């Protein structure tokens, strides 16, 4: 009565090598399904996170590797170019000969650098402004500094785009390394220290004096001027509510309410929003709906920008520009960012060029590289069985809202309307291996040189933001993918209201048809519930069905979401991270991901138990000694077998919408009751607390 | 029938995933067995070559981190100094902060560097001499330049240490190399680039001018000067023979026959020789015997060193000394290495820090890092068994004697008398546990520096050299083991006629207690037929049973076992290896490995005969449709399951004695006659060849 075939072997002794039978499963899950896999694993100097779902993110880079290095003479112009990119960006050789000269001749395009500028006011102070400034590298090169300018979709309205204004990134992850105490010292000396080495080789290259004394006060300004910038943003946590988001507005009345001062002169939004849409030929009027997302940065913005001069505003809008392209000049402006890598990832090299050229053709030519990835490592026979995959979860959650006490029922008679109403996307879109002409014309404008990387990331960046800025005008694309085909992980829009389960997830051990049905559910099961309950989520349950942000909630229902939810908030606030030193999990910006792991668990393993009683029992595997029900677990959290960087660990906590793998099993598990019953766990145990959480 | 234990499982896992069922065994069965290797596994970016073999070792160096990188308060002081030394190796951020000043304060111990010198002349010219440049080279740092001089183990005298005079090496990897056409073109290339690089940093961080003309003018000099003793070494083919190269002579017919002119005086071999053995204070009388092994060597040198300034050897003897310590600097002295490094192995990055350290520390500590490895790794339970496997494969091969032809009756009875005498070591040294005095004591002269690596490998040098010169006088230790336990591999001493086994290599696939005996026996039970076999090929079969280089081969026995021993040269010469860009095999340099490889799973596979014949059938594997004397045969064949890079397959196949793992699977079974009876291959198929060789 025990499976014996070819892979019933090679699937159950994955499951051993990573588990460690020697720990309890009811004191610690994490380790008594990883205790083997941290043993065996250690942390690459390449990554700052490793686990087994970064490691399937390292097996799709090598299969893209194949497909790319390979010139197959007889393929499309859409696929020469993939490939033609892609030798560009592997050939150190011609990029080392270079140095810098490919990103200091177009530093005149951007106003250029002050601080490396024998004479910049003479030559760009004349003709300088700061509408025109931010938005040369906002349109051409798709750099967002001090004001964030983009083109998305309209939350009221998901068929028509809409100009959104928004409080901009910055140079560290997020804005707590700019309190530059404690555990983010190392970071602010590095960057600024990045700064000043990057500053030091760019006068070496252009025969310029390097004034040192000049350089070390110089560039502090900029790191002045982006702390006060920083200080001025709006806290991540009161930007989960989008309703509290949303403030349309007319340009005028932007105009009116901030106002910003800029070497003693008003600033222009009209000017500034015109120089950005005049690229693509769309004239902006006075008249125009903008919804403003940040109000009260920009009203902490005006006594900022006002007591520096526009030579310290070009610094630390053209440091942003620069930072992101030194790793892309010769060996000698490369490493000027391993102490500022290190000191963000805790990574003592880059990873792999053909690694990172892989991403890259893969970021930028998402149906090309697509195209060739499910050609080469994606089954057909896989799309009629997660879609019935899909059809039994969402079935499932809809038969779950009955069982849930804290809402009423007339917000349960359009929670299933918006369930009924949620659109799938398996696989991959069939148009970019049926129409070569289709995929031809898509890259038609693009033209790839050999021994001209620069000069093609460059041509990304100009495409990419004249591709976006374009839609303002026209409606949203029903039919657009939100994502590649080549992509390890699972998608959902709220205002598209879809799920998207790229081929590149649907693997092992997420899903196989030579795989059993209890690491099935256990895998792609838990993932479509995730996603699925990512629609009901802190965000997501403010859109309704047709994805417009619209309030569908009673008063009494709303606020019990809200109750609800306030335990997964407490409960992974409390989590201690070994790695981070002690610090705790953000319980706020994890919300999001927290409900959709412990709803997409449980309703995975519905789904399964109405698999086991309507299809029957499944045959053991051999070599462990699990039922098909704790074997349910035992795959979902061999999923997230990793450990991160010490590094890495701070950046993850306050960039990181997840929790990290080892909390995602204890605190998905500790809500479960269905877990408890299967390992048979006491009372008051770590992984069966008597409170437990409970949203969907 | 069938095992069903937890080790079964993953280990009939590992077969299935490593073979290629689709593939034909007597097509080619190294495709048959390690296609599916081939598609699961890619070489990474810091592996020259990525095989089954090397996993284990770099399986390995993750237990040698364990137990290195904590230290503990029980540890004895050479533990405490392998942790010291192991420390002081990962503190990347120490040895960046010391650039190259570690490097530049010790160059004048080696009459500096010409190019790197504002004026060498005025400041070593004075006191510089080819004897004390050569021998402060070789006494304190292990550089061989120009003349290779080492204190070993006298061939004829198997008891005694005496002096050697042998050619030395190359900066390139063999003689061949200085060609620089064809495959050796980007070889060339790189080396004379990284030898100006060098310079340039050395003299920027001295703050001395550079002139890229100067430099590269003194640097191709350096390779025209290198060229030409390249050309003066005789071939590797031309080494094999032990009975050709001893030539014993005293130190006064050395001076008669081997004169060197230098800068216009004469070369004084006694100034030489005792400038080095001064160092452990013994003198090197004209009645010294010593062991010339290059004499056509030593005769081309003259027309040759007479042509070239003091300046001109300096700069190719000191860059000898800095190219292999410039990647024990700072990170800019490690890139400096990346084109020449790339274009000798393929690799694009150096490998992890903490690999290196571990295998640093393994290296210079074997008894104390193989002390820390036995006790976390090693079950002492195995030795037991393992012996008992020697004695079935050593009673086979004396066996075997009767089924050889080719041999006289009184030569069988010689050989059956070395075979007998074969002393064993399995596993470890007794004393590297059980006596913490002696490792202890074995240490007492480091002492190592918390922040000093630099200062630490240089006093590693020093103690390396003086370990072996201090023992011209001394009796060859029988009891000293060749080899470290924490090794994967497996040894065999002509002079000691004994074959080590250290722990290392005993484990899977090769050997473990919860592994089928087939595997055992086509696993650690082949090594140790290829380890019996080495005292009987081209080479090992010129000792006797003590040891001593004599003859005890009769002219017609010698003269038939080269005429078996040619089939070999032919069938591995004749394979064309496609990674290496279709160069042949070397049969000649490979003949060695490829007797002993070829006797030894003969062997291996008549003692797992006669294990069956006594002990009865085993149980089958799990989802292997496969007999144990077919997996047998598999287990042998995917310890190779591996690839190279094209960089590294020129590489190796000038510098590796043993043939590719591809070549080593097919020439071997190839040549077994069992091989194609046990999976049942036509005759003259690929795999099957009518015609087989058959040494042992
Ligand atoms: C990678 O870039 C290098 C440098 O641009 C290329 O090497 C050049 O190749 C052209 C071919 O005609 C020669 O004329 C140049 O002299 C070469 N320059 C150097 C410095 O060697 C190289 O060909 C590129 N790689 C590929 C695959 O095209
Ligand atoms: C935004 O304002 C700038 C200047 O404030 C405008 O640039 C001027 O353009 C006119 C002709 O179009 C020239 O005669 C001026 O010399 C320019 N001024 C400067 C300082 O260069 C720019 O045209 C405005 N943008 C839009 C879309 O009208
Ligand atoms: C390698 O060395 C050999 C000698 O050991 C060189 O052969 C000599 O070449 C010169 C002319 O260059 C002749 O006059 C001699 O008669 C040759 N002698 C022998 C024994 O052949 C050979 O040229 C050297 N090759 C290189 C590339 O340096
Ligand atoms: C060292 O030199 C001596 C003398 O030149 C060599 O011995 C001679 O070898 C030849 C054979 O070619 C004989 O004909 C002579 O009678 C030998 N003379 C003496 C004095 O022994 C000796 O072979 C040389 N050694 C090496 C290793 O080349
Ligand atoms: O963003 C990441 O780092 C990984 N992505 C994730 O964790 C989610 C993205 S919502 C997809 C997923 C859900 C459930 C299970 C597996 C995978
Ligand atoms: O040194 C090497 O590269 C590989 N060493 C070997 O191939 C031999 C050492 S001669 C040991 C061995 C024999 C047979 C099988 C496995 C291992
Ligand atoms: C941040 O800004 C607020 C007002 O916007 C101000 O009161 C506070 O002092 C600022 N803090 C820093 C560190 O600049
Ligand atoms: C590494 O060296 C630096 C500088 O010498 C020192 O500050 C640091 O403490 C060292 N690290 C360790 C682990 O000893
Ligand atoms: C070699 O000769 C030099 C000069 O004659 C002398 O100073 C030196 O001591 C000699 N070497 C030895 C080892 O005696
Ligand atoms: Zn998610
Ligand atoms: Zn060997």
Same mark, same amino acid.
């Given at each position: 009565?025990?499976?014996?075939?070819?892979?019933?072997?090679?699937?159950?002794?994955?499951?051993?090598?990573? $588990?460690?039978?020697?720990?309890?499963?009811?004191?610690?899950?994490?380790?008594?399904?990883?205790?083997?896999?941290?043993?065996?694993?250690?942390?690459?100097?390449?990554?700052?996170?490793?686990?087994?779902?970064?490691?399937?993110?390292?097996?799709?880079?090598?299969?893209?590797?194949?497909?790319?290095?390979?010139?197959?003479?007889? =393929?499309?112009?859409?696929?020469?170019?993939?490939?033609?990119?892609?030798?560009?960006?592997?050939?150190?050789?011609?990029?080392?000969?270079?140095?810098?000269?490919?990103?200091?001749?177009?530093?005149?395009?951007?106003?250029?650098?002050?601080?490396?500028?024998?004479?910049?006011?003479? *030559?760009?102070?004349?003709?300088?402004?700061?509408?025109?400034?931010?938005?040369?590298?906002?349109?051409?090169?798709?750099?967002?500094?001090?004001?964030?300018?983009?083109?998305?979709?309209?939350?009221?309205?998901?068929?028509?785009?809409?100009?959104?204004?928004?409080?901009?990134?910055?140079?560290?992850?997020?804005?707590?390394?700019?309190?530059?105490?404690?555990?983010?010292?190392?970071?602010?000396?590095?960057?600024?220290?990045?700064?000043?080495?990057?500053?030091?080789?760019?006068? #070496?290259?252009?025969?310029?004096?390097?004034?040192?004394?000049?350089?070390?006060?110089?560039?502090?300004?900029?790191?002045?001027?982006?702390?006060?910038?920083?200080?001025?943003?709006?806290?991540?946590?009161?930007?989960?509510?989008?309703?509290?988001?949303?403030?349309? $507005?007319?340009?005028?009345?932007?105009?009116?309410?901030?106002?910003?001062?800029?070497?003693?002169?008003?600033?222009?939004?009209?000017?500034?929003?015109?120089?950005?849409?005049?690229?693509?030929?769309?004239?902006?009027?006075?008249?125009?709906?903008?919804?403003?997302?940040?109000?009260?940065?920009?009203?902490?913005?005006?006594?900022?920008?006002?007591?520096?001069?526009?030579?310290?505003?070009?610094?630390?809008?053209?440091?942003?520009?620069?930072?992101?392209?030194?790793?892309?000049?010769?060996?000698?402006?490369?490493?000027?960012?391993?102490?500022?890598?290190?000191?963000?990832?805790?990574?003592?090299?880059?990873?792999?060029?053909?690694?990172?050229?892989?991403?890259?053709?893969?970021?930028?030519?998402?149906?090309?590289?697509?195209?060739?990835?499910?050609?080469?490592?994606?089954?057909?026979?896989?799309?009629?069985?997660?879609?019935?995959?899909?059809?039994?979860?969402?079935?499932?959650?809809?038969?779950?809202?009955?069982?849930?006490?804290?809402?009423?029922?007339? *917000?349960?008679?359009?929670?299933?309307?918006?369930?009924?109403?949620?659109?799938?996307?398996?696989?991959?879109?069939?148009?970019?291996?049926?129409?070569?002409?289709?995929?031809?014309?898509?890259?038609?404008?693009?033209?790839?040189?050999?021994?001209?990387?620069?000069?093609?990331?460059?041509?990304?960046?100009?495409?990419?933001?004249?591709?976006?800025?374009?839609?303002?005008?026209?409606?949203?694309?029903?039919?657009?993918?939100?994502?590649?085909?080549?992509?390890?992980?699972?998608?959902?829009?709220?205002?598209?209201?879809?799920?998207?389960?790229?081929?590149?997830?649907? #693997?092992?051990?997420?899903?196989?048809?030579?795989?059993?049905?209890?690491?099935?559910?256990?895998?792609?099961? $838990?993932?479509?519930?995730?996603?699925?309950?990512?629609?009901?989520?802190?965000?997501?349950?403010?859109?309704?069905?047709?994805? =417009?942000?619209?309030?569908?909630?009673?008063?009494?229902?709303?606020?019990?979401?809200?109750?609800?939810?306030?335990?997964?908030?407490?409960?992974?606030?409390?989590?201690?991270?070994?790695?981070?030193?002690?610090?705790?999990?953000?319980?706020?910006?994890?919300?999001?991901?927290?409900?959709?792991?412990?709803?997409?668990?449980?309703?995975?393993?519905?789904?399964?138990?109405?698999?086991?009683?309507?299809?029957?029992?499944?045959?053991?595997?051999?070599?462990?000694?699990?039922?098909?029900?704790?074997?349910?677990?035992?795959?979902?959290?061999?999923?997230?077998?990793?450990?991160?960087?010490?590094?890495?660990?701070?950046?993850?906590?306050? *960039?990181?919408?997840?929790?990290?793998?080892?909390?995602?099993?204890?605190?998905?598990?500790?809500?479960?009751?269905?877990?408890?019953?299967?390992?048979?766990?006491?009372?008051?145990?770590?992984?069966?607390?008597?409170?437990?959480?409970?949203?969907?």
């Amino acid at each position: 009565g025990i499976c014996k075939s070819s892979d019933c072997i090679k699937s159950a002794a994955r499951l051993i090598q990573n $588990m460690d039978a020697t720990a309890e499963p009811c004191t610690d899950f994490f380790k008594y399904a990883c205790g083997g896999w941290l043993k065996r694993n250690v942390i690459p100097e390449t990554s700052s996170r490793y686990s087994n779902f970064d490691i399937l993110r390292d097996e799709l880079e090598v299969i893209l590797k194949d497909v790319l290095q390979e010139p197959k003479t007889e =393929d499309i112009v859409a696929v020469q170019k993939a490939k033609t990119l892609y030798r560009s960006c592997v050939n150190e050789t011609a990029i080392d000969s270079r140095g810098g000269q490919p990103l200091l001749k177009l530093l005149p395009d951007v106003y250029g650098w002050p601080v490396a500028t024998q004479n910049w006011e003479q *030559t760009y102070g004349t003709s300088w402004s700061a509408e025109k400034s931010i938005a040369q590298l906002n349109s051409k090169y798709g750099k967002k500094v001090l004001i964030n300018f983009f083109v998305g979709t309209d939350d009221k309205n998901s068929m028509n785009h809409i100009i959104h204004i928004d409080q901009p990134r910055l140079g560290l992850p997020s804005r707590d390394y700019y309190e530059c105490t404690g555990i983010y010292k190392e970071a602010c000396t590095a960057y600024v220290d990045f700064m000043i080495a990057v500053a030091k080789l760019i006068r #070496q290259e252009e025969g310029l004096p390097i004034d040192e004394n000049q350089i070390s006060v110089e560039m502090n300004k900029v790191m002045e001027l982006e702390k006060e910038i920083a200080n001025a943003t709006t806290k991540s946590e009161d930007r989960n509510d989008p309703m509290l988001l949303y403030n349309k $507005m007319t340009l005028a009345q932007i105009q009116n309410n901030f106002s910003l001062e800029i070497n003693g002169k008003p600033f222009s939004w009209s000017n500034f929003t015109n120089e950005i849409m005049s690229t693509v030929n769309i004239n902006i009027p006075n008249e125009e709906d903008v919804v403003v997302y940040a109000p009260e940065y920009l009203i902490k913005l005006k006594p900022i920008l006002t007591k520096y001069s526009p030579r310290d505003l070009q610094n630390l809008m053209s440091w942003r520009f620069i930072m992101d392209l030194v790793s892309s000049l010769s060996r000698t402006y490369k490493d000027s960012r391993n102490a500022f890598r290190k000191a963000l990832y805790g990574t003592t090299s880059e990873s792999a060029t053909w690694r990172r050229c892989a991403n890259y053709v893969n970021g930028n030519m998402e149906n090309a590289v697509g195209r060739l990835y499910v050609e080469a490592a994606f089954a057909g026979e896989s799309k009629h069985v997660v879609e019935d995959l899909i059809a039994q979860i969402r079935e499932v959650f809809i038969q779950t809202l009955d069982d849930l006490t804290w809402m009423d029922a007339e *917000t349960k008679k359009k929670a299933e309307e918006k369930a009924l109403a949620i659109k799938e996307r398996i696989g991959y879109p069939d148009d970019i291996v049926s129409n070569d002409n289709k995929l031809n014309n898509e890259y038609l404008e693009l033209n790839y040189k050999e021994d001209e990387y620069f000069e093609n990331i460059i041509q990304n960046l100009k495409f990419s933001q004249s591709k976006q800025l374009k839609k303002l005008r026209e409606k949203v694309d029903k039919d657009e993918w939100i994502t590649g085909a080549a992509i390890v992980n699972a998608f959902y829009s709220s205002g598209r209201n879809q799920i998207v389960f790229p081929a590149g997830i649907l #693997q092992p051990p997420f899903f196989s048809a030579q795989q059993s049905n209890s690491l099935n559910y256990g895998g792609i099961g $838990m993932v479509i519930g995730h996603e699925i309950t990512h629609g009901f989520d802190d965000n997501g349950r403010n859109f309704n069905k047709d994805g =417009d942000l619209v309030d569908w909630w009673t008063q009494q229902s709303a606020n019990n979401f809200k109750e609800q939810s306030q335990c997964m908030v407490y409960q992974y606030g409390n989590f201690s991270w070994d790695l981070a030193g002690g610090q705790h999990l953000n319980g706020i910006n994890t919300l999001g991901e927290n409900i959709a792991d412990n709803g997409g668990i449980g309703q995975a393993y519905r789904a399964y138990q109405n698999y086991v009683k309507k299809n029957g029992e499944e045959k053991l595997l051999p070599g462990i000694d699990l039922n098909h029900k704790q074997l349910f677990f035992l795959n979902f959290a061999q999923v997230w077998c990793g450990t991160y960087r010490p590094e890495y660990a701070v950046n993850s906590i306050k *960039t990181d919408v997840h929790s990290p793998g080892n909390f995602r099993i204890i605190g998905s598990l500790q809500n479960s009751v269905e877990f408890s019953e299967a390992f048979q766990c006491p009372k008051n145990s770590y992984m069966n607390p008597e409170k437990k959480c409970r949203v969907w």
